[PDB]
A paper describes a structure:
The imidazole molecule was surrounded by hydrophobic side chains of Val199, Met210, Trp201, and Phe385, and a hydrogen bond was formed with the main chain amide of Thr294. The Arg214 side chain, which anchors the carboxy group of the substrate pHBA in PaPobA, swung out and was not in a conformation suitable for binding to the canonical substrate.
Para-hydroxybenzoate hydroxylase (PHBH) is a group A flavoprotein monooxygenase that hydroxylates p-hydroxybenzoate to protocatechuate (PCA). Among proteins in this clade, Xylophilus ampelinus PobA (XaPobA) preferred PCA as a substrate and is the first known natural PCA 5-hydroxylase (PCAH). The overall structure of XaPobA comprised a homodimer, with each unit binding an oxidized form of FAD in its active site.
Author numbering:
A (entry chain D): 3 to 19, 46 to 58, 71 to 99, 130 to 140, 152 to 170, 172 to 391
B (entry chain A): 1 to 391
Amino acid sequence: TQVGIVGAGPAGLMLAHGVLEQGTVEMLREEMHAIDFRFGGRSHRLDFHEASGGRRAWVEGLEDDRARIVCDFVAGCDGFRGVSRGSMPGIARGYDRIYPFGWLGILADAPPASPDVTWGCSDRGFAMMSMRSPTVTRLYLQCEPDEDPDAWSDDRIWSELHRRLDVEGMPSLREGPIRDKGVTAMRSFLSEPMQHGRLFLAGDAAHIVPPTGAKGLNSAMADIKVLAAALVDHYRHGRSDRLATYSERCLRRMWLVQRFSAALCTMVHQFPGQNEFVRRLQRADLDYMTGTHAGRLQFAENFTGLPIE
Amino acid sequence: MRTQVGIVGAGPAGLMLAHLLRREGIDAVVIERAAREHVRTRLRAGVLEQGTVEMLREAGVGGRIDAVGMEMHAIDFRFGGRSHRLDFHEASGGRRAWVYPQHEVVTDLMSACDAGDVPILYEAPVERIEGLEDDRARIVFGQDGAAGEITCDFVAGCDGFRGVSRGSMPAGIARGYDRIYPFGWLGILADAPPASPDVTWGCSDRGFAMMSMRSPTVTRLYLQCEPDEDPDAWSDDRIWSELHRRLDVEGMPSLREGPIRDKGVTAMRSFLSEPMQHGRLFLAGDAAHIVPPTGAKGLNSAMADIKVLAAALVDHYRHGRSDRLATYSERCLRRMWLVQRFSAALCTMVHQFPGQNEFVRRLQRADLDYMTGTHAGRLQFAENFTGLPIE
Ligand SMILES: Cc1cc2nc3c(=O)[nH]c(=O)nc-3n(C[C@H](O)[C@H](O)[C@H](O)COP(=O)(O)OP(=O)(O)OC[C@H]3O[C@@H](n4cnc5c(N)ncnc54)[C@H](O)[C@@H]3O)c2cc1C
Ligand SMILES: Cc1cc2nc3c(=O)[nH]c(=O)nc-3n(C[C@H](O)[C@H](O)[C@H](O)COP(=O)(O)OP(=O)(O)OC[C@H]3O[C@@H](n4cnc5c(N)ncnc54)[C@H](O)[C@@H]3O)c2cc1C
Ligand SMILES: [Ca+2]
Ligand SMILES: [Ca+2]
């Protein structure tokens, strides 16, 4: 064939054809207004819809004449554990930072106590309440990176979620039967370049982020929006400049996405043994982000999605 | 020997407070450990926030800043081989900063204090501060071996990072937050007229450097160096070599060299102590908090503390209300944690950290790109650099 797509993820199916950015929605087409950051015993509802001016969120032979997937071009869409990223010659460079924690996630048959996605930036550790339906809620707890889910009974999970999320004046967390308990990792990684000859990387094969900020899929999509158009210009108008600049343009937008994702991750989680000045700057960062127009503006523009080149 | 407010330290914070109190009729005595001639000739550059300039102007000591203070509109951030001129006057909607050296602020304030007969004791190091919950506080000092005591309603601890007032808090009350960064600054003056007029920051992966105007014919230059560094390990040739490497970009004039003088090394540290008051003791300025000099914030923060403290003391003596004294620390700390955030953000973005994680290192360029390249980034920089509001 012309284009050999490795991996059948959301990036692999978007080229052949959680929380989503407005750009990801319109790309699929072609509903969130605020996040409640809780800290210091108080709710801080950051209306990013208003601050953003109306944007919203929603819930072998790569140098030869032909490439061979054991086609003209190979689209690496095989995620963080695929083989496409290692399919390059000294060409690749890796930027890696793992965070000293994971997330314990549950799906509960209980109505959300509030309609906004809620971030509990507690000194016990991070917690998050997100919705799915008026009767189904999605919840996360910061936990040890290698945590055994068997150590967390249903009662332990609800107790800790209450401690990390409840504040006076807001409805308390509603409890219900628990489904889909699991532990997921927290890691920042990016690899350069994102192309080499006939091999083009996208999505998790190129770069992973911590889920704080909901960017891993939305960046995979923008990766595909760019790779798809370049292949269109190549096959339709005989124009190869877009393919040659694929890595350059994806990396520009992604390094700003890594920035935002990491900024949230390092702000809302507790780091064991951290320098006490750096630890107190987490609250200063939360106060500035929620409490000033400039802080709210930067959050709103980044959360709803950066432009795509 | 008896007064209303005893002020420990005749640096900018103490002199400003003595001056404000004098014009409100409130009696104060300033006690300073060094010699007047020493304090008067401590030369230090200075970038003043607009609020600081307004404060000096409204206290009758802004005449010379109004006459020769050099209005500053932009910083040139150099990285990735290019200049990025961030116009914070535009980004902030018209607020700005002024280049006006700290030693001339101190000259201005000392002249105002002397013209108002404010009593200042020099060569009189304070040894203890006691009676913080007595009817009147006691400042125990010595000139030579002569023991002295000043009795006062309130003690303003304006004696800097190395003073005695911070340690006079009951240690079960005070909490410190401290980070020493793993680098210092090698600083020089060069007898060469500045090639570019803007404050210029070299922020590339080769290491931090800074260039600014000391005077029309003298350039101030800083280089990131090792924290314990001997200035004698930096010959003139090594200095110019590193400065060219860290600052020069195509499309901007190359560095103008000239005689090097005033070579020295300074440390980089973020520190804040809580609370800023206990009983009759109120801390202000470097006695309470210091920042790394990226961002031009230490003197301006000391002046913000003094603005709040003087107004609280006026409310107490003039209007008989003590609630503003009661909230001094709460209000000053809220601002100062945001100043610490800003100074720290600049410091961790523009310096190379030895052995740093390569992902975290590359986010430095992402942060520079976002701060210079987006309206939202420029706005935040500009509002912080020109000065946050004061409560
Ligand atoms: C807990 C959690 C929450 C998240 N929340 C959000 C969110 O709210 N918003 C958001 O935008 N993102 C979110 N993400 C990130 C997002 O889910 C991922 O970034 C996304 O899966 C990336 O898509 P991808 O197709 O590139 O990778 P994947 O989805 O991992 O696709 C890789 C595919 O390739 C296949 N494959 C692997 N190796 C090979 C091989 N050798 N040959 C063939 N096939 C192979 C795999 O089996 C898999 O099907 C979250 C991630 C986690 C873990
Ligand atoms: C190189 C450099 C550049 C800077 N640039 C800027 C800038 O552009 N903008 C900015 O806002 N800030 C800047 N700063 C920070 C600023 O200089 C300080 O924050 C400022 O000096 C703080 O003033 P202060 O009155 O609190 O303390 P200090 O100036 O330290 O004065 C304290 C005084 O107390 C006296 N004292 C100490 N112990 C005793 C004792 N026991 N008894 C009596 N007296 C005592 C000392 O002798 C001294 O005179 C810079 C700092 C440096 C090092
Ligand atoms: Ca088990
Ligand atoms: Ca007594």
